[PDB]
Paper text:
The conformer a of TPQ has essentially the same conformation as the WT TPQ (normal form), whereas the conformer b is rotated by about 170° around the Cβ–Cγ axis (flipped form). For both conformers, the C4 hydroxyl group of TPQ forms H-bonds with the highly conserved Tyr residue (Tyr284 in AGAO) with a distance of 2.7 Å and 2.5 Å for the normal and flipped forms, respectively. The conformer b has the O5 carbonyl of TPQ not directed toward the substrate-binding site, indicating an inactive conformation. The 180°-flipped conformation of TPQox was found stable in both the WT and N381A mutant. The two conformers a and b observed in the X-ray structures of N381Aholo were reproduced by our N381A mutant models (OXNA, OXTNA) within an RMSD tolerance of 0.577 and 0.610 Å, respectively. We noticed that the ring-rotated state of TPQox (OXT) is slightly unstable with respect to the state in the unrotated conformation (ΔE(OXT) = 1.7 kcal mol−1) for the WT, while in the N381A mutant, OXTNA is more stable than OXNA by ΔE(OXTNA) = −2.6 kcal mol−1. The energy barrier of the N381A mutant for the TPQox ring rotation (ΔE(OXTNA) = 22.8 kcal mol−1) is lower by 4.2 kcal mol−1 than that of the WT, suggesting that the process can occur at room temperature. These features are consistent with the X-ray crystal structure of N381Aholo where the rotated conformation of TPQox could be observed only for the N381A mutant. During TPQox rotation, the methyl group of Ala381 retains its position in the N381A mutant, indicating that steric hindrance between TPQ and Asn381 is significantly reduced because of the small size of the side chain.
Residue numbers in the entry:
A (entry chain A), B (entry chain B): 9 to 628
């Protein structure tokens, strides 16, 4: 019955059929994106109409389309041809990954470059990399991938150990042409392997680790109903999955006595971009929009009990489309479990004699994805005390280059002759807020230092200030760690027992935002990443901070275009977009496979409750 | 055997005997501090000489002494009479706390103030708080505590719910005189109780939480030898305990192949200060130095299996002195265990076909202390990958006031009429560095943005810069979150296989530092807390950032005096002092008992190893 249920295989098959019947899915067509649409505001509630949105590519050069279908009624709601030079190219297809290597393997410029370096073409892998928009007028409206080479000495070899620097190719994947091969000169190809399962490199495996057994003898404390509806320690939510965003949380609410109180209507990672900071022309174009260009959900891993998710795990197995509209299950793609989280609250009171300790726990909803060299874990946490947190875990293998003779200001050395270009991994969390319902506002809260003098004669006082963000033109905010800056989302029409608007406070990690020059292509295409916190008025067509079609879009799409409407956000239906990321200067320790590093954010109740919400937790 | 072993009951008794034999510990003497000293630099130097340092108070009003004893040799090494008006009072004696309420109960000014508020003196608890240094000239050379009153309605009542605002008293705890009673006028005493074990306030306890069982069927992976020497997953260290600092970690080192490589010689929390930001005269003096004034270690909790420390726990039970020099055990005061820590490293490689996942774990060493309303957990972590981390967990009951009828810029409201003055909890971690031995230096590393132009035509480049801190004058540093500022400790004489000095990088949380006006008493007394990072040259007598005697002590000692020496720190035996803290504007959710909030820091290897140090971890 839930309108927030996961897509079923049969709904995907029904989309396929509706498309093919309407003449929209001929043999030259490929589905680049397919997803369920969320219910509209003020449903309502009823006539449910399950709608799916689809992006259709044409491998013969015809114009692509965006198409919305109703699976409930068996109809095409809309179908629109796209002018890609205007609104952007469609996401990279998985079937295009191989095509760059194949086209290059019979190109005489490419063969010449390899022969100069004494590289067997059979051994040369080519990473299929997004192109962006630079100086090349011929690319506008064409679907281009760029290719960087890596040598694989044998089938189980890690090619990332052996980058071929000084060489890059550009290909048109529709016309099957190689438009450019650029060879700026020969760099040694690093020779050490990076095969982290070779005993020669690992040494003897430790035998010192004794097992840690995590079990739940009565099963888990959460319940899953309707496929994806979770109830756990007062929390209620629905776990969605979209092929672009991955795991999406819906209807996050907390049962406070008699009332189910909404907090967040929709939480997702709406974009994630990896800009590179090496000004070599071999790589200076490189910015991977893992979410917007590649679609992270579609590459979600199947997660293995005991290895990936430890304890008493409940899995979801979302269904997506392949390029032809057939459903495909991602078996065990989502892990759900509850974890112990140490001490929740503790006090040993001398006067009363009462010694009190309670433990904390968190509900975890996670998935893991792989985009080329990169692997990312996305984790959402709900705590007993009302805190909501997101954490990204970045691992995989470093995307490598040569290490230049005489060093580099933009590349670090991992192994002899093996470089790691500097880069960032920057995320955007889109939080469609619903603090006690939809009438919300955001304040920026700074600590305020006070001067010693009258009213503060000992010079000890300090305070804080809150500034309401009233319109979108005022709602593009930056961090200020030194003044303890946070942002509070409140409902001005819902007051706690002390007569203050109920709120939640966003605590950021205050990591650096996008470092690129503000006149750069990437600063224009990933404008969201240049600032920490954006607030918009909700609109059903404002989904991603980079717009709908990120691939080879010229710039300005998404948030800077939304914010330019200058809408009222003071007690309205609003969306917070928080930028957060890692700035990576890769270490020797990151090679030949990187230990996890993390980044995230959290939101804590701020006078949302009338007292602690965990007084009813029993002693352990 | 090990000179870093915990003090034994026999050693403490023997110090008592030595002091007695020397004429230093007659019946009017009290031990305000006793601890074992670390071995001197250079131990090739011959056998053990276990030395103890003692601060001896005299209840008859004679001057106190600082004494160092050799328990090995049965000797007094040094004994000096202190002039406390100059160099500071001794730490507060546990026995002095009760004195404040006792003396006030028969003081006619106090009784008049209570009668004005219709309070029964038998029901009035008095929090006995450190006095600091303000304008009261009669206090100079005297041991003063200040008292703030709270009503306890019955023996098991939480008195913190019922502050008595407008009243404060000052007491000389040696002469047993009430020096001042200040009554600025009656405030309503908040009436709502805060009894978080009362069913009326908790409601029915949850029955929803199913057990999480954490076990180690083959026992733990670490070994404990010599009472306190830990070996775990390549790590080696000794776990000390000092009544002032609490848990202290010694000789932190990592076994890399055949070589035991030092990293940190000594890690501790060398001070913590809790400044209050309410300019009322009732509280504007309020700042406690839990470590330096109270001695956090002495108030360490006994930790109970299953609620404090969950899993397969190995306890230490440190021994300290009582006020007479008799040994007293803190049973189960230190928890040691290893925890699963999610994914360590993961990559699914398209080209090779190899899918690889490994799990992480951390070793945890922890203790929990209570002083008055506050309860703090101090946690040290060692990870498989070489990361070292500290976390403080703040909980307890909020220290309350009245909430003024017209609101307040410096106090938040918790419950009707009940206020929570703004304050901070600020720690200093003293890290006596030994990165591959003692020849170390610190660099400040900032991200460097680059301008689009020649050499960077696409405007994508970014870099970083490192600035060596060469002398102590230049080594007092502040955070810059926006430029990703970190500090690298390296050994300029020990290079990795890529010919770069081995290092560790300190990652701070970049929270606000001390907020008080720089002209305040607290800004002088807690000068360390005004800046994020200090580096000194190692010296035997430079232990605490506030000096040896913090109680009622003005500026003049500690870090600003040390740094004046302007010593060479560029490839020398050096000590990093990191300030980090929480700034607390208490919420309604923090009442009537507060959920844990955290703050800390970590250090990660930075070209310390020649490649990832966890390639030898097996599949789970
Ligand atoms: Cu990276
Ligand atoms: Cu606090």
């Amino acid at each position: 019955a839930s309108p927030f249920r996961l897509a079923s295989a049969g709904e995907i098959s029904e989309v396929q059929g509706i498309l093919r019947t309407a003449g929209l899915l001929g043999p030259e067509k490929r589905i680049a994106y397919l997803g369920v649409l969320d219910p509209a505001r003020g449903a309502g509630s009823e006539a449910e109409d399950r709608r799916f949105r689809v992006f259709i590519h044409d491998v013969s050069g015809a114009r692509p389309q965006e198409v919305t279908v109703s699976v409930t009624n068996g109809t095409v709601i809309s179908a629109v041809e796209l002018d890609t030079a205007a609104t952007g190219e469609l996401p990279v297809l998985e079937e295009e990954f191989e095509v760059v290597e194949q086209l290059l393997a019979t190109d005489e410029r490419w063969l010449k470059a390899l022969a100069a370096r004494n590289l067997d073409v059979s051994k040369v892998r080519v990473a299929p990399l997004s192109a962006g928009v630079f100086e090349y007028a011929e690319e506008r409206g064409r679907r281009i991938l760029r290719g960087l080479a890596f040598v694989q000495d044998f089938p189980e070899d890690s090619a990332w150990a052996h980058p071929v620097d000084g060489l890059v190719a550009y290909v048109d994947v529709v016309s099957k042409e190689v438009t450019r091969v650029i060879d700026t000169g020969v760099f040694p190809v690093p020779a050490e392997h990076g095969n982290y399962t070779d005993p020669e490199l690992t040494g003897p495996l430790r035998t010192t680790q004794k097992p840690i057994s995590i079990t739940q003898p009565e099963g888990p404390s959460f319940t899953v109903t309707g496929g994806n509806h979770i109830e756990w320690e007062k929390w209620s939510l629905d776990v969605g999955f979209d092929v672009r965003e991955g795991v999406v949380l819906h209807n996050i609410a907390f049962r406070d006595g008699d009332r189910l109180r909404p907090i967040i209507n929709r939480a997702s990672i709406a974009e994630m971009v990896v800009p590179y900071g090496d000004p070599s022309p071999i790589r200076s174009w490189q910015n991977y929009f893992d979410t917007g260009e590649y679609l992270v959900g579609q590459y979600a891993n199947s997660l293995e009990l005991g290895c990936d998710c430890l304890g008493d795990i409940t899995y979801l197995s979302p269904v997506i489309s392949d390029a032809f509209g057939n459903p495909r299950e991602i078996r065990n793609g989502i892990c759900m479990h509850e974890e112990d989280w140490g001490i929740l609250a503790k006090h040993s009171d001398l006067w009363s004699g009462i010694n009190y300790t309670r433990r904390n726990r968190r509900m975890v909803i996670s998935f893991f994805t792989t985009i080329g060299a990169y692997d990312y874990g996305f984790y959402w946490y709900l705590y007993l005390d009302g805190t909501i947190e997101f954490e990204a875990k970045a691992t995989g293998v470093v995307f490598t280059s040569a290490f230049p003779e005489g060093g580099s200001d933009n590349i670090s050395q991992l192994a002899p002759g093996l470089g790691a270009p500097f880069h960032q991994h920057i995320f955007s969390a889109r939080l469609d807020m619903a603090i006690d319902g939809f009438t919300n506002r955001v304040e920026e809260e700074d600590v305020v230092r006070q001067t010693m003098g009258p009213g503060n004669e000992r010079g000890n006082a300090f305070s804080r200030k809150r500034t309401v963000l009233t319109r979108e033109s005022e709602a593009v905010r930056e961090a200020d760690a030194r003044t303890g800056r946070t942002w509070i989302i409140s409902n001005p029409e819902s007051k706690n027992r002390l007569n203050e608007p109920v709120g939640y406070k966003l605590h950021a990690h205050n990591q650096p935002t996008l470092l690129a020059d503000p006149g750069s292509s990437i600063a224009r295409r990933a404008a969201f990443a240049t600032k920490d916190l954006w607030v918009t008025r909700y609109a059903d067509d404002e989904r991603y901070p980079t717009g709908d079609f990120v691939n080879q879009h010229s710039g300005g799409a998404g948030l800077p275009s939304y914010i330019a409407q200058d809408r009222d956000i003071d007690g309205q239906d609003i969306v917070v977009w928080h930028t957060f990321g890692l700035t990576h200067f890769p270490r020797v320790e990151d090679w030949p496979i990187m230990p996890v590093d993390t980044v995230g954010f959290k939101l804590r109740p701020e006078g949302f409750f009338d007292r602690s919400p965990v007084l009813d937790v029993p002693a352990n």
